[PDB]
């Protein structure tokens, strides 16, 4: 139970990190999508401005 308790709490870390790393990586790329999307749309304003 003591060993399983540590593994139980430690297993959540590996699962949380694996699940958080997927969201953290997507979060970093989300700014690129918004920046690239806004940059492309901003280019139209630059050509118009």
């Amino acid at each position: 139970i003591i060993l399983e308790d540590q593994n139980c709490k430690l297993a959540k870390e590996k699962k949380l990190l694996e699940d958080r790393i997927a969201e953290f990586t997507t979060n970093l790329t989300e700014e690129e999508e918004k920046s690239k999307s806004l940059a492309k749309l901003k280019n139209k304003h630059e050509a118009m401005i």
Partner: protein, 49 residues
């Protein structure tokens, strides 16, 4: 008297046997705590650290 004296030996063995019951559990507690005092400690520096 040999049989009577032998009864005291088996009776006294209960003390040594009883002490071994608590000694085995107490000694085993150090192994369980050491396995958690070091495993979680190393992980605490990675998760909490």
């Amino acid at each position: 008297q040999a049989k009577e004296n032998e009864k005291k030996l088996k009776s006294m063995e209960a003390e040594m046997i009883q002490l071994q019951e608590e000694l085995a559990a107490a000694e085993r507690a150090k192994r369980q705590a050491q396995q958690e005092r070091d495993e979680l400690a190393d992980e605490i520096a990675n998760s909490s650290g």
